[PDB]
Symmetry: D2
């Protein structure tokens, strides 16, 4: 009755037969967690939910993160209201792993679909575990143990189509407050111990132990490699979908093909520890 149906060999699974708007049992919570450990990104369909519920469900998997930036519902502040009619989304022209420019990148996130365009707006996910596993032996050896700079500043969109309000000052603010830092290039999953590539085009600027030119060659290699179809899935949203993914060993990509159409999601972020 609780059911896990894999979307592909590399990553992703749909879950059915457990109502996450209610309090879930420890057997359920565990099975879900094992699922997440295995398939890295998890989808539940036909699972309508509210902030309180969303917050409670997410909390069962890590301590939640209530933040200043972005929208927050009036009742629960630990659920962001991402709304097209308001905010903007030019932060996703490239593959991302979330907040890798933090010492302490999020463990993952739980995201519910509220209002969707007729179509468009897919999200892709890629597995750092599958992608790594597929590199040549010599290359896994060279990379495992190297480190990489992740830097918020790489997120700078500014005037591409010039949506940015005179307040590009929020952006400047976040910059001055989050200095570049480093994470392993090959990461070991804190819980499963499985190894994943942990560089993403969103924030990774440099492999520290290689020279600029080598770094640039290698990252160009690794960005294209990590995001090949073999290591990714593509989700077409439906309303009342819930996506639950492990941000420690995946990237994702929001396809921008639906503007000006309105899109409303609710996100709950689960705090993560130190990548190693």
């Amino acid at each position: 009755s609780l059911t896990i149906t894999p979307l592909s060999p590399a990553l992703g699974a749909q879950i059915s037969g457990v109502d996450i708007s209610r309090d879930i049992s420890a057997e359920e919570r565990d099975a879900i967690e094992q699922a997440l450990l295995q398939h890295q990104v998890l989808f539940l369909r036909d699972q309508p939910i509210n902030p309180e519920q969303q917050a409670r469900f997410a909390a069962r998997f890590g301590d939640l993160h209530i933040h200043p930036i972005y929208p927050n519902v009036p009742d629960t502040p630990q659920v962001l209201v991402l709304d097209t009619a308001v905010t903007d989304v030019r932060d996703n022209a490239v593959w991302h792993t979330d907040v890798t420019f933090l010492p302490t990148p999020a463990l993952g996130a739980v995201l519910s679909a509220k209002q969707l365009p007729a179509y468009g707006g897919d999200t892709l996910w890629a597995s750092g575990i599958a992608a790594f596993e597929a590199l040549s032996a010599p290359l896994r050896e060279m990379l495992d143990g190297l480190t990489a700079t992740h830097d918020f500043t790489k997120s700078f969109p500014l005037e591409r189509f010039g949506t940015t309000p005179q307040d590009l000052a929020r952006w400047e603010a976040t910059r001055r407050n989050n200095p570049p830092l480093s994470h392993p290039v090959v990461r070991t999953h804190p819980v499963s111990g499985r190894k994943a590539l942990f560089v993403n085009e969103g924030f990774t600027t440099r492999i520290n132990e290689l020279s600029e030119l080598e770094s640039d060659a290698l990252l160009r290699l690794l960005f294209a490699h990590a995001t090949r179809p073999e290591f990714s899935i593509r989700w077409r949203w439906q309303e009342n979908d819930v996506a639950f993914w492990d941000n420690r060993v995946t990237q994702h990509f929001a396809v921008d093909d639906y503007r000006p159409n309105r899109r409303v999601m609710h996100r709950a972020t689960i705090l993560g520890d130190a990548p190693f």
Copy 2:
């Protein structure tokens, strides 16, 4: 009642409310035809057909191709049987457009899913139309009028046919029969008039009017550009699925992650005219 449900803005639509295991009505045929010209790749689920039903259907959209060299159904040799027990699948391991090395590459294909692995073996399509429209104007202006060389051997080197001196002669004949030839880089669809990128990593070796070095840069750019998520869809197959796509303005990619699991598809191929 025949419904057409867009799968993504760039391309793709799912069709239902039509029974293609029988002979379809002028009206239906027409709506599908339009749907093809609009959405470029079409899908039907739960639409089991035998070789003959599949041939009757495909023939409603152009002349068929009886290839008398691969494993086809003896009774209706218009339908080719692609079984992983018997035949292999090396061909779809890279983004390609079907047989562009022919002066008259295939118009399109009808594909029917027999037996499948639980999951894995997705196929991706990409729109030459949407990719082209997405290039900036100066790049469109330069490429529109350039030609490119397509070469059968690029996807089928000597190593493909085998080691035997028998496979060698076989192969050297096929090559003698298909010298490298040229097509427009930007193809005008002969029915819709919509312009499309018409290079593919599977067979395009060279942009003719550019230097090797310039060509290499441009094709590496175009290949990446044209297979971006914004220009593609990804189909997860189920038994009795049917895919019908226009091979004049698309590309496709068969994810290789099911081996050794067995996979059987029936394909009928509709003959095309000279790209311009």
Copy 3:
């Protein structure tokens, strides 16, 4: 006056004249005509002092008096580079001088005062030869496009900031020099010759292309424009004079002599707006 070509693509050595003293109106014209043809001119065994250097450089254009570096007192018109005083982390990438300016230097006169035994070659490349070697369709696309030149490509300080004492001058030049644009294909204001006018040092973006398209084209242009066919390489020797047109060339200072020391005087000649 003798003029002796060094490569089909660019560069010529000069002799039969002495430039430590004013030159005839015929000699100067002959030189300007050499500079316009050969793009970079060299003079061996031509000892000179800031005063004469200035006098010579000035007969080819208006001279510059800053330029964010240590200069000789008697002649503010002559910059003194000394690897003991001033490092050179900005010369070992191909660049065209001050393209981040609204109006980059016409070119410079450079004198060899003190040099290591060997090492520290300087390479020069021609945007005229480079451009003419591109295919017709590619010249047609590029000709008319523009590119962003950003002072902070050839620096970012090695991210030496946070450090404040010596870096405040960096964010100053940065604030004083926002990224601006130049045509990708420049028409030489005298000769009418067309040249590639992008350089890896400062050029960050082709404005009219997307970022991915720009990135591809720039990788291609940066490699193409510095192939052997379009460049020359000068082994320096004390008392040398290099005089180059910075409107249609790039140059590269090989960094292979550290920790050896090296001293040279520059007169930069002010330029006009690229088109």
Copy 4:
């Protein structure tokens, strides 16, 4: 015997020994040592005839003889390279000589006879200097890997001709020199210095990497190994002699002089199996 280094990476001008003579064991030893340090050696104003050039080249190994090429009648040990008789191309990609062979040439001795007034420079690049400049993680990964070298990378089918007598000579050479492998990091058989041993001319694949990875890596190595820091550019004059070590270098013939006549004489010294 005087050895004047041209750059820290490689290259030295030699004098105090007339190599058109029968030289001493001692002078021959000093030359070999200079070659082992500098990788490429140059003599100016060294007229030499084919008999002498061979007698000199043989002092450093066995020599390659005659066919099916244009050697001087009495001297099958010296190849005569004339533009008037034989057209030359794709010496215009960077390459190491005959790396597709099991035992690529040790090196060559090259004499300049008749030169264009200018153009026709040759660049050399040090694979030792270039290896040492790679980051440790890269050196550690590359050192032990092997790569495929393939005659047909630079001599594709179309360089022979649609003529049936050309496809018989090329299929046989393609069958006579099928692709094979050398170490990516070569250990000089005499000095033990380690060097990158790939080159754009012949190297197709890093075997223990995937195609995709090989592609990105070779593209890095090719650009890197030919940077200005690890190369020199020789401007030829008549009666120059260049003598290079093909075990650890790459070279490039700028093609910018045609249709002007260039006549060179080359003796090739036979090499052994790279490890």
